[PDB]
A paper describes a structure:
To stabilize ATP-mediated contacts between ClpC protomers, we used a catalytically inactive mutant (E280A/E618A, referred to as ClpCDWB) that binds ATP but does not hydrolyze it. To resolve the functional units of the activated unfoldase at higher resolution, we performed a focused cryo-EM analysis of the single hexamers. The most prominent feature of the cryo-EM reconstruction is a well-defined, 80-Å-long density that penetrates the entire ClpC pore, proceeding from the top of the D1 to the bottom of the D2 ring. Although it is not possible to discern side chains, the density should represent the protein backbone of the captured mSA-Kre substrate, comprising 26 residues present in an extended conformation. The six ClpC subunits adopt a spiral arrangement, engaging the substrate in a similar manner to that observed in the related double-ring AAA unfoldases ClpA, ClpB, and Hsp104 (Gates et al., 2017; Lopez et al., 2020; Rizo et al., 2019). Five ClpC protomers (P1–P5, P1 as lowermost and P5 uppermost unit in the AAA ring) interact with the substrate through conserved tyrosine-bearing pore loops in the D1 and D2 domains, while the “seam” protomer (P6) is detached from the substrate, transitioning from the bottom to the top position of the spiral. In both rings, the substrate-engaging P2–P5 protomers are present in an ATP-bound state (except P2-D2), whereas protomers P1 and P6 accommodate ADP or are present in an apo state. These structural data are consistent with the previously suggested “hand-over-hand” translocation mechanism (Puchades et al., 2020), according to which nucleotide exchange is coupled with substrate release and upward movement of the seam protomer P6 to rebind ATP and substrate. In conclusion, the cryo-EM structure of the reconstituted ternary complex provides a snapshot of ClpC in the process of unfolding a BacPROTAC-tethered substrate.
Phosphorylated arginine residues (pArg) serve as a degradation signal that is recognized by the ClpC:ClpP (ClpCP) protease, a quasi-proteasomal particle critical for microbial protein quality control, stress tolerance, and pathogenicity (Trentini et al., 2016). The ClpC protomer contains an amino-terminal domain (ClpCNTD), two AAA (ATPases associated with diverse cellular activities) domains termed D1 and D2, and a coiled coil (M domain) inserted into D1. In the active ClpC hexamer, the D1 and D2 domains form two stacked ATPase rings that power substrate unfolding and translocation.
Numbering used by the authors:
A (entry chain A): 158 to 408, 469 to 665, 681 to 806
B (entry chain B): 717 to 807
C (entry chain B): 206 to 408
D (entry chain B): 513 to 614
E (entry chain F): 206 to 247, 255 to 285, 295 to 307
F (entry chain F): 615 to 662, 682 to 716
């Protein structure tokens, strides 16, 4: 009473479990016991493991195979062979009338002449598709009569959304299968997982693994990788480190630096950001800021103090890290401070989720923010801000021109400031926990000694919008008077950037501070913001490159100095 | 009366949550009365009070923590010794 | 036997066979063989032009010539479109004239949703088939069912099931298991409890 | 709010004792009163006392259902309309966990 | 190996076999013959392919190579299973 | 060439803005398509001499964001249409 075909096309977990070739199974005791409890029934023994990819469903199947041989089952499963199978391997051919149904009939005929096979199907949400879609002899329409009478015994393994989508075929498929929810393990659970089988990858790679190594593996896989679960991520980082260390040994100990190195190579943040700033990024974040940001030093030290206060603090993790509103004119540095801190908080930022609330002018415009109802226009994706954060829920949100919101949105804002994690989507609850909500404010420029401006702007907020609203917001970062010498300073910074760019193109330009001063005076007016300066320096540099390359007056490789010696830009190339 | 009561309750909850970090903290009743003194029922209640306890107590402890004065296992009280928030830090 | 899923269509057909053996059936129905004609086991080995309908021709000729044979078909809605190929003479058409003339003596079991989906709108074959609907037993009929069925579950779990427990299982299943149907969901409760108790007795 | 608390407790013990009306819900309440009195904190208190995570509380914010056509977000949109398949932001939420606090 | 056609993906496998002949490869991957598959030269093709799988079981040092892997996995009938076993 | 860009919307506008920043658009597969030697010429009517020389920037900075203007290579404006 043996099974030729089923053994030919389905791996026998029991057989390779005899040989101790199977890796250990750690934890999951409650889940495996529940699996056995379901398998012990008489009519529908089939459990369907519902979780997320990479959580350890197949690990639970392996553990069950283990406990079978290791005399752990309650003698109703004693000597029963677990066989993993995949329908994809079964089908293998569709251009012919009945080949597939023939394979599956053979398989059923072997399950008959046996009692010890419990066929573990991975991703049985694909058990309904084969052959005709929903009106012909698919796989399910021939499994169901056997499944309902205990003829066949099974262990399915789906994903939650696949269960929800492909148990709309309820009638048979649901009642034939009992769900067993398996959830992804926590940090500590996963650390113990790893400590279970460190002596497997150690023996495979002949490399030594430390405990802080796997701690960093788990912490890193959580912080810097998403769209992948545990213990998958962890064991994968560990094994990648094992292989890479083995190679480096040729042309014997994995440590946290290697874990950082593999995570960096995966996601793209540099290694210096991951490892060394792990608890000192807040220690030098003010240095990072005052490097990237020039001016408004009082504002930047206020922000630094607030973020390190919330950072090395006991604040409720649930609600968002920082709620700051910048009062000031435009062009004073609102975005630069944001990008700088984000680059210092979430290293290598590219993360400021900017939203212009002046675009969400009116009442119904808030549906553009959250999304349309189901039976209405533009509902499928929608959710500008909601989908934006749902994508990467680890960043810094900047909301431009908070004033221009109709009062309809301030409600959503205060809900967010009420512990975040707002459910403002088509059934999606987005979480704003590690984020930082920042709001570009109104003019507020007229009020801008220190205490005077302060009381003024507080009253302007009283008159402007709710006191309760700012009672929600943490800090009021005031963007003081426009730049006077910081003008020339930011000219210098941009020109340093542009000189680097011009140098890597095999040139060298050095503009003296007199020309910098002239560009400063021209570019930005006293009333106007400091933004056109970008354009001003662009036009001057494009003119000089245009003329000098067109005229040919200059030769490549000769340093280029600009001055205002004649009252105009004079270029002395030599 | 219920307002001072809920000051007491919020302080208790706050210490409860701070026990996550193994920090030992106490609030004198004088601090509780002073904290409630800002909250008034004239307009509305228990919103300004919660924000006030959060701000004063937690931010002040964070200030005296990043200044390095206290570590875990120490005993701390925020007291009003002169009519305004101050830290006694019985340690 | 159009009805909801967990109601016992297949159970009804089996009850018919059991009545056949017990001799309770009428004389005209006495000594007939109920067969479970699966389509998966029929359309299997063809992969050619003239083999599926060949098997069905031979099956029909046997049935016509064989005196006493009833044919029970689970998931009747698979007759339509069975032998789907270039040849495209599916089982539903090979049987149609013989079904209507009355020689082939079928017993179809389907699911009401499958009935309305693609045997009601898409067939015009709900002519050769009398739709005798089957629906949930009452709260009391389910009790009688399950209590009549209690011996097998005793045997399997090797425990003893107190009848108050059966009453309670049915009454609770009625209140809040809304998605499923009786006696299926009641039996599920009894069965899982038996498994839990046996497993407790083990450890 | 001894009155509110005892009312809620009576409701939950009616439910948990074998006496509640099997037809209609465990209990229905309308919590009137000024802003900030704690009439939302009672809901969290109740879910915590009756469940664990206290996030089993299914919460709807009727400040967003003002446009009077969003009612097609509680129950799904009709058949031939967008968002018919994933319908019931409220209905499915409650279908999942039937022992919960709305 | 994912890439556009003609970018030299198979060239990478070739240079790999080269570095295999040399010592650049570490020891675990030492003694590894890289081969390919002629679907043409191999009712009976299943027999020959299963024989190939027997020889794969014989010596566990035969790193195989597959071009156009999608249209290959027919052979999947015993390759995809043999992948799972290892 | 993009004609009637004014008829666009802030989302497709941000799309073409980050394009004009690097040309790298990624649609339907994340395809990192390169804009190596392409030309980006946008066409519209905000005008509809010196007074026009001013009103053009007026309705540009007034019709959409100034950063997209600041990704200028050159702006070609012809007012007179009859001669
Ligand atoms: N408790 C555990 N015991 C053994 N392996 C585990 C455990 N938890 C996670 N894993 C590892 O996670 C990986 C993926 O788990 P698996 O169940 O195969 O994912 P999926 O659920 O998509 O099949 C496996 O390699 C497995 O070794
Ligand atoms: N404090 C500062 N340090 C460095 N650069 C600054 C500072 N303030 C403004 N800038 C310059 O201003 C420009 C940012 O303009 P932008 O942020 O768009 O203005 P706004 O925030 O009003 O929209 C950047 O080029 C930046 O170099
Ligand atoms: N009696 C109370 N016990 C505990 N917390 C309370 C109490 N009264 C008010 N609160 C606090 O006040 C807020 C409750 O006010 P809430 O009912 O939400 O007001 P509204 O919904 O009208 O804005 C929460 O922050 C809550 O913790
Ligand atoms: N890095 C390289 N060094 C040397 N030759 C290369 C390199 N990349 C590609 N080639 C050449 O490409 C040709 C074949 O490319 P091939 O790998 O067959 O393309 P594909 O990957 O699409 O099959 C070979 O002649 C090979 O020498």
């Amino acid at each position: 009473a043996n099974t030729p075909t089923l053994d030919s096309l389905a791996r026998d977990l029991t057989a390779i479990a005899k040989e101790d070739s199977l890796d250990p199974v750690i934890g999951r005791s409650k889940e495996i016991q529940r699996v056995i409890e379901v398998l012990s029934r008489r009519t529908k023994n089939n459990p369907v493991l519902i979780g997320e990819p990479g959580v350890g469903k197949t690990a639970i199947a392996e553990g069950l195979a283990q406990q079978i041989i290791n005399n752990e089952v309650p003698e109703i499963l004693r000597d029963k062979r677990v066989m993993t199978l995949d329908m994809g391997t079964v089908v293998a051919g569709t251009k012919y009338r009945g080949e597939f149904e023939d394979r599956l009939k053979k398989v059923m005929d072997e399950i008959r002449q046996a009692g010890n096979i419990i066929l573990f199907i991975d991703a049985l949400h694909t058990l309904i598709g084969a052959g005709g879609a929903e009106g012909a002899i698919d796989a399910s329409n021939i499994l169901k009569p056997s499944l309902a009478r205990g003829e066949l015994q099974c262990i399915g393994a789906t994903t939650l959304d696949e269960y929800r989508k492909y148990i709309e075929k309820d009638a048979a498929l649901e009642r034939r299968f009992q769900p067993i929810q398996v959830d992804q393990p926590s940090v500590d659970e996963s650390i113990q997982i790893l400590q279970g089988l460190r002596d497997r990858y150690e023996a495979h790679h002949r490399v030594s693994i430390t405990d802080d190594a796997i701690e960093a593996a788990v912490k890193l896989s959580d912080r810097y990788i998403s769209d992948r679960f545990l213990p998958d991520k962890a064991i994968d980082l560990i094994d990648e480190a094992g292989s890479k260390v083995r190679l480096r040994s040729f042309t014997s100990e994995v440590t946290v630096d290697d874990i950082a190195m593999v995570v960096s190579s995966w996601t793209g943040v540099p290694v210096s950001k991951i490892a060394q700033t792990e608890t000192d990024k807040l220690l030098n974040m003010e240095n990072i800021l005052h490097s990237r940001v020039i001016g408004q030093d009082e504002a930047v030290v206020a922000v630094a103090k607030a973020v390190r206060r919330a950072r090395a603090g006991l604040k409720d993790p649930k609600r968002p890290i920082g709620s700051f509103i910048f009062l000031g004119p435009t062009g004073v540095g609102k975005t630069e401070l944001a990008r700088a801190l984000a680059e210092s908080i979430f290293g290598d930022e590219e993360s400021m989720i900017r939203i212009d609330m002046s675009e969400y002018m009116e009442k119904h415009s808030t549906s553009r923010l959250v999304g349309s109802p189901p039976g209405y226009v533009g509902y499928d994706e929608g959710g500008q801000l909601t989908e934006k954060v749902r994508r990467k829920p680890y960043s810094v949100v900047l909301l431009d021109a908070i004033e221009k919101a109709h009062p309809d949105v301030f409600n959503i804002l205060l809900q967010v400031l009420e512990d975040g994690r707002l459910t403002d989507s088509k059934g999606r609850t987005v979480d704003f926990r590690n984020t930082i909500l920042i709001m570009t404010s109104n003019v507020g420029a007229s009020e801008l000694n220190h205490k005077d401006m302060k009381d003024k702007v507080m009253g302007e907020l009283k008159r402007a919008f709710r006191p309760e609203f700012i009672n929600r917001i943490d800090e009021i970062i005031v963007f003081h008077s426009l730049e006077k010498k910081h003008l020339t300073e930011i000219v210098s910074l941009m020109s340093d950037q542009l000189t680097k760019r011009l140098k890597e193109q095999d040139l060298s330009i050095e503009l003296t501070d007199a020309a910098k001063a002239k560009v400063a005076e021209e570019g930005v007016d006293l009333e106007y913001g400091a933004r056109p300066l970008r354009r001003a320096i662009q036009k001057h540099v494009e003119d000089r490159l245009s003329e000098e390359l067109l005229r040919g007056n200059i030769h490549k490789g000769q340093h280029i100095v600009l001055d205002v010696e004649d009252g105009e830009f004079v270029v002395k190339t030599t | 009366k219920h307002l001072t009561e809920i000051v007491s309750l919020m302080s208790d909850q706050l210490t409860k949550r701070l026990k996550e970090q193994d920090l030992s903290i106490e609030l004198t009743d004088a601090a509780k009365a002073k904290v409630a003194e800002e909250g008034v029922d004239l307009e509305y209640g228990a919103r300004p009070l919660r924000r006030a306890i959060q701000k004063h107590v937690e931010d002040r402890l964070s200030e005296e923590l990043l200044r390095g004065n206290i570590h875990k296992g120490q005993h701390i009280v925020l007291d009003v010794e002169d009519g305004e928030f101050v830290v006694k830090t019985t340690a």
